[PDB]
């Protein structure tokens, strides 16, 4: 009697993925530890092959 | 009284002469090598010392 929606095939859909982000915002900065200083930039380049420094 | 490169102490022209003549004269040699690694130079010449690098 009716074309009766119970019959015609019904498609589905999809859409492109999106990137979720798990979040705990991490700062705790600036603080210890911060503040580049010199001899630490002496360890930056060699030396600093283990295990010594002061 | 004299030219006195030691008594008026010219640091040039002396210490290198000492070390070289030391190497030639005393032996051993060889046996034992001459001119080992310079990581030892890092051992005496700073930095990296402390108790003896490998």
Curated annotation (Swiss-Prot), chains A, B:
Reported function: Capsid protein self-assembles, with the help of the scaffolding protein gp11, to form an icosahedral capsid with a T=7 symmetry, about 61 nm in diameter. The capsid encapsulates the genomic DNA.
Organism, scientific name: Bacillus phage SPP1 (Bacteriophage SPP1)
Part of the whole protein covered: 2 to 55 of 324
Compartment annotation: Virion
Complex and partners: Interacts with the scaffolding protein gp11. Interacts with the decoration protein gp12.
Family: Belongs to the lambda phage major capsid protein family.
Record protein name field: Major capsid protein
């Amino acid at each position: 009697a009716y074309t009766k929606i119970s019959d015609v095939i019904v498609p589905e859909l999809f859409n492109p993925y999106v990137i979720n982000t798990t979040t705990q915002l991490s700062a705790f900065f600036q603080s210890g530890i911060a503040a580049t200083d010199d001899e630490l930039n002496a360890l930056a380049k060699k030396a600093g092959g283990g295990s010594t420094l002061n």
